[PDB]
Design a protein that fits this description.
- The structure is cut from a larger assembly and holds chains A (53 residues) and B (46 residues).
- Chain A has 53 residues and is mainly alpha-helical.
- Chain A is 96% helix and 0% strand.
- Chain A has one helix at residues 2-52.
- The longest helix of chain B has 19 residues, at 2-20.
- Chain B is an all-alpha fold and 46 residues long.
- Helix content of chain B is 50%, strand content 0%.
- Chain B has helices at residues 2-20, 35-38.
- Chain B has 2 helices and no strands.
- Classes of the chains: A mainly alpha (53), B mainly alpha (46).
- Chain B: This is ATP synthase protein 8.
- Chain B: Its main location: mitochondrion.
- Chain B: F-type ATPases have 2 components, CF(1) - the catalytic core - and CF(0) - the membrane proton channel.
- Chain B: Keywords: ATP synthesis, CF(0), Hydrogen ion transport, Ion transport, Membrane, Mitochondrion, Transmembrane, Transmembrane helix, Transport.
C-alpha cells in the first residue's frame, strides 16, 4: 500500500505536467480559431470580388 | 471462618476477573488498502 501510494503521487505529478500541456494546447487552439476566422474573411472578400467580375 | 472464606473467595474471583481481562490476542490486521484510493490527482481547468 505504501509503494502504490508513492506511484499514485508520481501519477498525480505527471497529471500536473499534462495540465501544463493542456493550457498550451488551449492557447494554440485559440490562435487556430482566430487564424481560421481570418481565412474565412479573406475567402469572403475574394468571393465578393469574383462576383463583381 | 465464613467471613474470611467470603473475603478470600471474592478477592480471588476478582483476581481471576483481572486475569481474564488481560487474556486477549491483539490482532494487528488493520489493512492499509484505503491509501490505494486516498490520493486524488490535481484537477485541471476546463
Amino acid at each position: 500500500g505504501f509503494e502504490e501510494a508513492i506511484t499514485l503521487e508520481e501519477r498525480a505529478q505527471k497529471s500536473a505536467e499534462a495540465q501544463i500541456m493542456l493550457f498550451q494546447a488551449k492557447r494554440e487552439n485559440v490562435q487556430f480559431q482566430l487564424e481560421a476566422a481570418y481565412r474565412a474573411r479573406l475567402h469572403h472578400v475574394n468571393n465578393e470580388i469574383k462576383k463583381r467580375l | 471462618p465464613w467471613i474470611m472464606v467470603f473475603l478470600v473467595s471474592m478477592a480471588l474471583l476478582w483476581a481471576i476477573m483481572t486475569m481474564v481481562f488481560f487474556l486477549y490476542q491483539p490482532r494487528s490486521v488493520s489493512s492499509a488498502k484505503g491509501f490505494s484510493d486516498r490520493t486524488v490527482y490535481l484537477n485541471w481547468k476546463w
